[PDB]
Each structure stands twice: as C-alpha cells, then as structure tokens.
Design an enzyme around this catalytic site. Structure first.
Site, PDB file in Angstrom:
ATOM      1  N   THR A  68       7.082  70.046  55.727  1.00  0.00           N
ATOM      2  CA  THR A  68       7.970  68.897  55.839  1.00  0.00           C
ATOM      3  C   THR A  68       8.580  68.812  57.230  1.00  0.00           C
ATOM      4  OG1 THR A  68       9.934  70.115  55.139  1.00  0.00           O
ATOM      5  CG2 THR A  68       8.574  69.140  53.436  1.00  0.00           C
ATOM      6  N   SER A  69       8.960  67.591  57.613  1.00  0.00           N
ATOM      7  CA  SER A  69       9.653  67.392  58.877  1.00  0.00           C
ATOM      8  C   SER A  69      11.060  67.975  58.809  1.00  0.00           C
ATOM      9  CB  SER A  69       9.725  65.908  59.220  1.00  0.00           C
ATOM     10  OG  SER A  69      10.436  65.213  58.219  1.00  0.00           O
ATOM     11  N   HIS A 128       9.794  75.951  60.864  1.00  0.00           N
ATOM     12  CA  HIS A 128       9.567  76.644  59.615  1.00  0.00           C
ATOM     13  C   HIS A 128       9.206  78.105  59.876  1.00  0.00           C
ATOM     14  CE1 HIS A 128      10.015  73.260  56.922  1.00  0.00           C
ATOM     15  NE2 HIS A 128       9.190  72.537  57.657  1.00  0.00           N
ATOM     16  N   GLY A 129       9.377  78.937  58.849  1.00  0.00           N
ATOM     17  CA  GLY A 129       8.958  80.324  58.995  1.00  0.00           C
ATOM     18  C   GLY A 129       8.922  81.048  57.671  1.00  0.00           C
ATOM     19  N   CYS A 168      13.095  79.890  58.219  1.00  0.00           N
ATOM     20  CA  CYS A 168      13.208  80.685  57.009  1.00  0.00           C
ATOM     21  C   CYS A 168      12.504  82.018  57.187  1.00  0.00           C
ATOM     22  CB  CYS A 168      12.617  79.969  55.807  1.00  0.00           C
ATOM     23  SG  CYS A 168      13.647  78.566  55.319  1.00  0.00           S
TER      24      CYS A 168
END
Ligand code: NA
Ligand code: NA
Lengths: 240, 4, 240, 4
Positions: free
Chosen positions: A34-35, A93-94, A135
């Site tokens: 997701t953006s 993200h992560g 994350c």
C-alpha cells in the site's frame, strides 16, 4: 596543553556530513504494498530538521531495491574525510531486518555493510546513524494503563519500533516516531547528548500516541521505539 | 493511523 | 513547590530491586555444549558490583531451561512495589534471540515477557534491565586498523555483542563484556547516566580487547556490544 | 580466549 578527555565524537570537522533520506511512498502494483500516506510530511520534517543541524541533506523518492543498493554503494564510495558523521533515514515498508524498495525488499545488513569500519575508510571512527521508520513484523502493542576497532563499531540504529512490531504512521501528521524525533532534535540538539535525545523520543512516542481504528484488531495500540547503539563515544550535534 |  | 522535571526514573524507593544472576557453566553432556571457563569470575564480579549499588543479588548456577523459566516466572510474581528497578544477568551459551539452559534453549522473549508492563504490575513504569553475555550467532568481527504505556517500554537489553556475532570469554579473566561492564559501573555509577556508562563499556570492549588463537579462523578478532534501549527516562543509580 |  592541559588535561584532555576523549569521551565524545569529534563533531567540528568542516562538514557535519551527509543526511540521505530515502522516502518510499508509492510501490509497484505487483508487490501489493500500500501507499504510505503521510510519509512526505516525515521527509520534509527530516529535511528541515537536519538542515538546521548543518547536514548536507539529499532526499530520494520512490527507489527500487536496485536503486537503494546503488545509492548506498555510491555514497559509501565518496570521500567523507572532511565530514564528522553520516546519517541515513529510511522511510518505507519493512519487516524484521528488511526495508522495502518499491519493487521488493533490501536487507538492512546489505545497506549498512557498505559503511563498515573496513569498507568506508573515511568514516572509520565516525558515527554512522541509521534512522528507520518501517515495520519490523506484525505484532501490536496493547499497552497497559498507568589497535583495531570492530567493523560494527560506531553505528547507531534509531528504530521506530520494537523488534517484531508494526510501526504506526498517521496519514495526515506523519509517523509517530519521525514526528517525535524531529520535535526532540529541534528542542534539544543544542542541549543534550544524542542518546538522551532519543530517550525523550522514546517517552514521547510511548506516552502521547495511541492508535484509533474502526477495526478492533488495530484500535487502541501503543508503540515504543528501539535504540540500538554500537557507538563508542557520546554524540553532541554542537561543538565548542 | 496506518501501519507500515 | 517550585518547578519540577520528570526526565529520570525514580530510584529512591526503599529498595533498588533484585539482581538475578543466572550463571550457566556446565551443560548436560547430551547437548554437546562446552563448559564456560571463566564464567564464575564474571558471576562473582557482578555479585560484588551490584551489591555495592545496593541491589538484592541472587546468584543461580547451572539451571535447566525448565528451572530458568520457573525462576523468572516466580520472580515476576513477587511484589516489587517497594523496589526501584529490576536487573537480570544471563551468562550462558546462546544464539540470536536465545540463551541456553543446561539442557536446551530458552527464548529470550519468553523470559522477558514475564516482566511486560501488563504482566508484572509492580514493575510497570520501572526500568527492567537484562544483561546478556552469550553468543548471538557465529559471525566474527575481523576489525579494522585505526494514558497507557507500551508493554515493551522501560526495558533495556545490554547485549555483550552485536546481533549475529560470537561473544568472547577469557577462561582466566572472565568475559570481555562483563569485565568491562563491572569496571565501568564501579568507576562511573555515582557519576554518569546509565546509557553513558554503557557507551564507555562499548569503547572499552572495542579498543582494549582482541582475541588470540592458534586457530587462524578465531585469531585477531574484535567485539562491539549492543545497547538496546526501550527506556523512557534517564537512569541514574544514585539519587539526591 | 573462547567463544560462547
Ligand atoms: Na512511527
Ligand atoms: Na564478552
């Protein structure tokens, strides 16, 4: 001259150093990621905050995994001899040990290895700061009511969240962690040693933020950042 | 509020 | 009264708190784990060092994985209301995220979860310090020449070595990390905030130690400890 | 010197 002590990093080189900000907002559709609404607020806050600390800030947006690795490699190959420190901020993200390029993941170890004491000689003995808003897993915090040197030395990882946990980002205000970090650097960089600044960031994130969600699984959740220090000296952004 |  | 600030943990409760030292030296033959020569030197150094900081020290030797979990559970069920803090020291074999009982492994997460903000209410808001001398993998550092609160808040993990790396123990002098930690607590506990003490420990381990081995694979290696702080305040072992 |  008189007695001397060596308990703090030398931060009076001609330049403070680079601040590389990687701001990944939009991801390739095929990844299904997701953006990241609000991340531009973070990226602008960081640019201004580190500008006022006299870092040479470079903002990069929406980089593939290949572009991330090439950027870090090229930056690690510059001559940092006249620079006091190095800062890299990752917004993406992560999961545990991983940050995402727009088209897939990059091991954090791969990025930081370019700056190892033996692989970037013009940063040997200088503080290398990695600030990570991403994350680290999918856990949610429910809260409770109230001579050689090692090649891994002189790194500091300022993680937005505890190992294994999600990290929270507000689509209007930016991420909890970056909001708080910039606020504490603004207020205390001319006053406090860096670990003490990051401790105030920990307290701000832990006490002032709680998630609001229509989804009971994600509602009323808390966050604590994680300071990972392999530094060998005190770090003050100011000098005498 | 969103997660990363 | 006059203006007040709240930047440091309250450490003037009637008791400083418990210091639990788990000293695993001899392991069940079936595990194939080697005996940890020098660990008794560490355990005695820690007992004396934390005694002089006025902790109630309890030393436990050669505990099985079952005994470790039962000990931590029972300690977490005590009433810590009159105690300022909690300290647990783990001396054993390990790998990433794991420490070994004499008969097999224990997840560090399992141990620390007993003390979560929501699961040990008499330690909520108080610093919970875990000091870990144990390997975290098999990497070797070659060196280079020179309101609610989160349930994970208020923990500090003072790791002897970087994630993924071996940790070094001298059979005569004790472990590099515990030697250095006790020396810096002795010298600076009445002077410095705890993160600044642990930074001096980082520097001592990084600069003063290098392995000597007849085996080229293990010779001339270095070590950096890893401070993992989720604390929300400054920690001083003294009070006014 | 030994490793853990
Ligand atoms: Na955050
Ligand atoms: Na050690």
């Amino acid at each position: 001259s008189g007695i001397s002590l060596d308990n703090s990093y030398k931060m009076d080189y001609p330049e403070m150093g680079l601040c590389i900000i990687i701001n990944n907002k939009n991801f390739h559709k095929s990844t299904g990621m997701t953006s990241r609404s609000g991340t531009d607020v973070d990226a602008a806050n960081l640019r201004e905050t580190f500008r006022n600390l006299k870092y040479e800030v470079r903002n990069k947006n929406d980089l593939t995994r290949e572009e991330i690795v090439e950027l870090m490699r090229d930056v690690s190959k510059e001559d940092h001899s006249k620079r006091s420190s190095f800062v890299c901020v990752l917004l993406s993200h992560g999961e545990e040990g991983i940050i995402f390029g727009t088209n897939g993941p990059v091991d954090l170890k791969k990025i930081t290895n370019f700056f190892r004491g033996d692989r970037c000689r013009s940063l040997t003995g200088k503080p290398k700061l990695f600030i990570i808003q991403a994350c680290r897993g999918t856990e949610l915090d429910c809260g409770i009511e109230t001579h050689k040197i090692p090649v891994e030395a002189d790194f500091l990882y300022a993680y937005s969240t505890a190992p294994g946990y999600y990290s929270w980002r507000n689509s209007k205000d930016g991420s909890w962690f970056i909001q708080s970090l910039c606020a504490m650097l603004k207020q205390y960089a001319d006053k406090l040693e860096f670990m003490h600044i990051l401790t105030r960031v920990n307290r701000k994130v832990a006490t002032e933020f709680e998630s609001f969600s229509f989804d009971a699984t994600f509602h009323a959740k808390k966050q604590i950042p994680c300071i990972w220090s392999m530094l060998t000296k005190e770090l003050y952004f100011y000098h005498l | 509020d969103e997660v990363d």
